[PDB]
């Protein structure tokens, strides 16, 4: 038997779909090296894994705030740059820990079967407006769409007023049928189990091309950065250097964002993307306008008494 050469944790469903179409299964080939992809991937899995000296993933996709939050515990190992090699990723994408490969808006998309005419954000927060909703399963993404809901304009987020986005998630907290991740989203849409949710634009419009009548937005979307990076510890260390090499290349990037609705952070991969892919993205000035960046700096130095905060107002309000 072969036991995996490289383990990835990542998200599950069709975005784990799409990088093992344009990573996981192009390096295997590659390099000969069996590459698995697994679910999981977060601050709290990270952080425990690491602490406990049984490191069983070699590679990580970190979102940007659990990507400081790991940074913060020294949870992860400098990225070899004598390896990884992509002048065509900017400088600040290329961190001493982690390498920004991908670029993802979150998106508010209702269920066009209910909602003909689309859904605003002011209207996902209105409790007047009946639909069965589906909100971020962490405080990350989930307040700053409140507050752009509630009228903070995208520009003025942050600082974020933390006590004002729950009292306007409290506002239609009867109608949220759940705090989930990007997976049971994807299967809620496409099942038609839920009416309107706020999740990324790769899993909406992969629900679309599954056949799902929905629809969605730029306005109160929130964009992040996606990094790879490794943790302290890791069985395969320089086989994950390589991988994330192999990875950040303007073709591997070029086909990861061919497959799903996320943009590339190399530069290169938008000389062999067709020009019709860049009106999707975060970044086209159409949709950046209508929505924010997450601010990785605000939750680097907020996320451990809002998650505090947001554990308890979930346990105290969830109701499914
Ligand atoms: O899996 C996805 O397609 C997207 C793309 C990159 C990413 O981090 N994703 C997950 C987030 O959209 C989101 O589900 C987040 O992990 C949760 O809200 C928990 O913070």
């Not at 000296?53 to 940074?71: K, R």
């Not at 998309?109 to 409790?127: I, Y």
């Not at 943790?231 to 990037?253: C, D, L, R, S």
């Amino acid at each position: 038997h072969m036991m995996a050469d490289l383990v990835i944790s990542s998200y599950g469903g069709s975005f784990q779909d799409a990088q093992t179409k344009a990573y996981f299964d192009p390096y295997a080939k590659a390099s000969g090296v069996k590459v698995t992809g697994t679910t999981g991937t977060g601050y709290a899995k990270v952080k425990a894994m690491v602490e406990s000296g049984n490191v069983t993933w070699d590679v990580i996709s970190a979102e940007s705030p659990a990507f400081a939050s790991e940074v913060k515990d020294g949870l992860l190992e400098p990225i070899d740059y004598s390896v990884v090699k992509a002048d065509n990723v900017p400088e600040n994408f290329r961190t001493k820990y982690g390498v920004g490969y991908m670029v993802f808006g979150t998106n508010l998309a209702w269920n066009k079967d209910k909602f003909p005419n689309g859904v605003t954000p002011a209207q996902f927060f209105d409790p007047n407006v009946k639909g069965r909703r589906v909100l971020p399963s962490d405080a990350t993404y989930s307040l700053e769409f409140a507050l752009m809901g509630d009228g903070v304009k995208p520009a003025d987020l942050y600082p974020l007023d933390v006590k004002r986005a729950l009292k306007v998630i409290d506002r239609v907290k009867d109608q949220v049928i759940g705090y989930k991740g990007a997976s049971d989203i994807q299967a809620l849409m496409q099942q038609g189990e839920a009416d309107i949710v706020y999740a990324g634009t790769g899993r909406i419009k992969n629900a679309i091309k599954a056949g799902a009548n929905w629809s969605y937005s730029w306005e109160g979307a929130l964009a992040d950065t996606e990094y790879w990076a490794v943790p302290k510890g890791a069985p395969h260390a320089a086989e994950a250097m390589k991988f994330i090499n192999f990875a950040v290349q303007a073709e591997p990037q070029a086909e990861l964002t061919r497959v799903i609705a996320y943009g590339p952070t190399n530069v290169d991969a938008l000389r062999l993307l067709d020009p019709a892919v860049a009106k999707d993205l975060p970044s086209y000035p159409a949709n950046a306008k209508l929505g924010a960046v997450l601010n990785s700096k605000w939750w680097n130095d907020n996320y451990d008494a809002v998650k505090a905060e947001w554990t308890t107002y979930i346990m105290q309000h969830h109701h499914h």
